[PDB]
Amino acid sequence: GSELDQLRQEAEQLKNQIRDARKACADATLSQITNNIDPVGRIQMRTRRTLRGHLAKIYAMHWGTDSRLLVSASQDGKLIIWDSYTTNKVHAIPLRSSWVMTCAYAPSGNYVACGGLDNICSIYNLKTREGNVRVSRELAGHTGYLSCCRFLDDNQIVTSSGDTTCALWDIETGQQTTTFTGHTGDVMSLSLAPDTRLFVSGACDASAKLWDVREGMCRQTFTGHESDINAICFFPNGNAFATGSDDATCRLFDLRADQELMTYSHDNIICGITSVSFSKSGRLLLAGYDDFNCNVWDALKADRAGVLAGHDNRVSCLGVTDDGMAVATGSWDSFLKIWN
Amino acid sequence: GCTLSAEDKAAVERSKMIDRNLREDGEKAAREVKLLLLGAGESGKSTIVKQMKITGIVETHFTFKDLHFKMFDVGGQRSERKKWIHCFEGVTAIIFCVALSDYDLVLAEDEEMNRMHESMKLFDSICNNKWFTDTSIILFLNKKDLFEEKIKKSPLTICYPEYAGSNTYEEAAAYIQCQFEDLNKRKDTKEIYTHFTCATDTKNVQFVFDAVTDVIIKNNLKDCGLF
């Protein structure tokens, strides 16, 4: 058809123009400019606390906003709240579905979000007059496994599922106020901006997309990976982010430049990255692999500076405190470790 | 502890009580059998569940002779299988259902590829997975009565051009069973259980119970070191 041919040629011309515009703004590289700075020495971290009590593989965790409490989820059917300072358990929530794959902590400390592989996102209220934790709202409407959920405030939450669609919900009512579509493969992870105005998502089609909470449509798309994307995280500044994939390669993308800056990979690593996180100052990039240990990279020189060995199975979750005092890693051996 | 105040020892006692409750609840979840269910969609898994009946994940819990079975059906998911299959690594057994009347039938989307070839490819993919290298597979063959009714009107040579036999019920059943069992590549770590479905629930329940008991006793003998 003439219309189909003209649409295809218009799309090809637009893609070529976008590629040419991206190439035009490429004058130098991050490594060459940064090479003049003094590299940081070897980083030594030792475990302090060991959190035990789970009886199955741990799939998600999230640090509290006070840098003292955390929450962990595992397939045994329990959601456990840990006090890191004294290694005490505050609450243990029995789940209706044991196939949990994500969890999230409210920024105010009153609610906890749970979900995964059940098309239902549950909200649990911690501050109750009756003295027990009870579910307050069940959100439904997805047609695929739930992969990630993040709080915005006490009445807003953003979720991503396996149906190639992200949703912004309203807890009080229970209806999707905004839907984001455009991904081909399944959506695996999302990251919220510090100002809670934009967020980014990574999909199984080796792509990442920058969305808009207030507007509701995609803004920019980033490519470069050769396999599935499993993790994503914003820079502390908020003008760049990092992606981890299954081809033993991490990448750093810039929102303002809309291009690639640095690539972190080694010839001795052939496994897949499972978690990606940053530091308080944005200098250390922590990557949790499935080779039973985590790695620490220099975000400005792409040189490895430490390995956090100590886990006997896959490392699936990793988190860094708001004040940057410690880092918590979880694994499939039902053990959590705190490093500093 | 001596440094702990009066408001810190009560927290320790509460944590110990939580630990005791978790330990008590964890020993009851290991006394139940977990069975994954797979198939070809319309291969007849629904009627198999119906014979032994008491969105993405369907759970069926039922007891028989003081033994509890929990069965996970994942038919209504429609997602990427490789991104969540490792969640079912610790299942006791995987049930795979095959219809005997699909050899003449073809796929609705395309008539080039038979339903039998698709079922065989699915069985080969599931059996040789890296996560299920030591998990038992129970193969059910259903819709045998209609297959027997229609066997005379169409030779099996349409589905298998290289077949040369008496074109009777026993020979065709043995040939199909052998072709399904020949797809195994380990032959030392896992075995395939084959049964022909009947109209009586008791036979199917007894076969499932015997299979799971044999799997459990073999596994525990292997862990004991004698086997």
Epitope: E130, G131, N132 | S5, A6, E7, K9, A10, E13, M17
Partner: single-chain antibody
Amino acid sequence: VQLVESGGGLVQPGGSRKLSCSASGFAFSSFGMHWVRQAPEKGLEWVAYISSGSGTIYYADTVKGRFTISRDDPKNTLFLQMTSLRSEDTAMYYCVRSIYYYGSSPFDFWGQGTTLTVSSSDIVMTQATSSVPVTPGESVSISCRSSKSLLHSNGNTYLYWFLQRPGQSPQLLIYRMSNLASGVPDRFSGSGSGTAFTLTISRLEAEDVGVYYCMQHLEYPLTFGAGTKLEL
């Protein structure tokens, strides 16, 4: 949520009695229980404490070896058995719930109270004043002092402020000397350091008339302060 206690009445000096209270509206099996005594025209007095699961039981030196405390979670009931009753056991008895974990606020609900009449080291906590006549529209400051420092190595300061309206059960106002309770106006404030503590109230109305008590929870036994009265 409500606690209802009973078992009162007048008895001869030689006799044994049982006080029974029932809880309804919350998980009775997750809250530790305290018994509090109040002599007529006097202040409060701690009696006994039982933990969740009957793990730790604490008694008062005055009634040690003479009072028994029992808990029934099947029936959601608390029992207090008294064997020998002297002439100083005539008072009002309350039942208090308290849950201990990181960020919790003990001493939430104080029950209703029952009357018991009979015919015929520790930390000293002191109240500065005893009666301050005031008028609505002005701030009121109340001072409390402790013999020993209530500050711990972790930084906590176990101080609790209470208020008993005329004919009403006491209620919690401030816990740990800095944290405001739930359901009270933001006007009430508390502060202090070391052995000195201050409670300030602003924009008083006619309904804020009662007695304020300062209590320490650093170590057992729990000692209540004196009583400061306010007038309209």
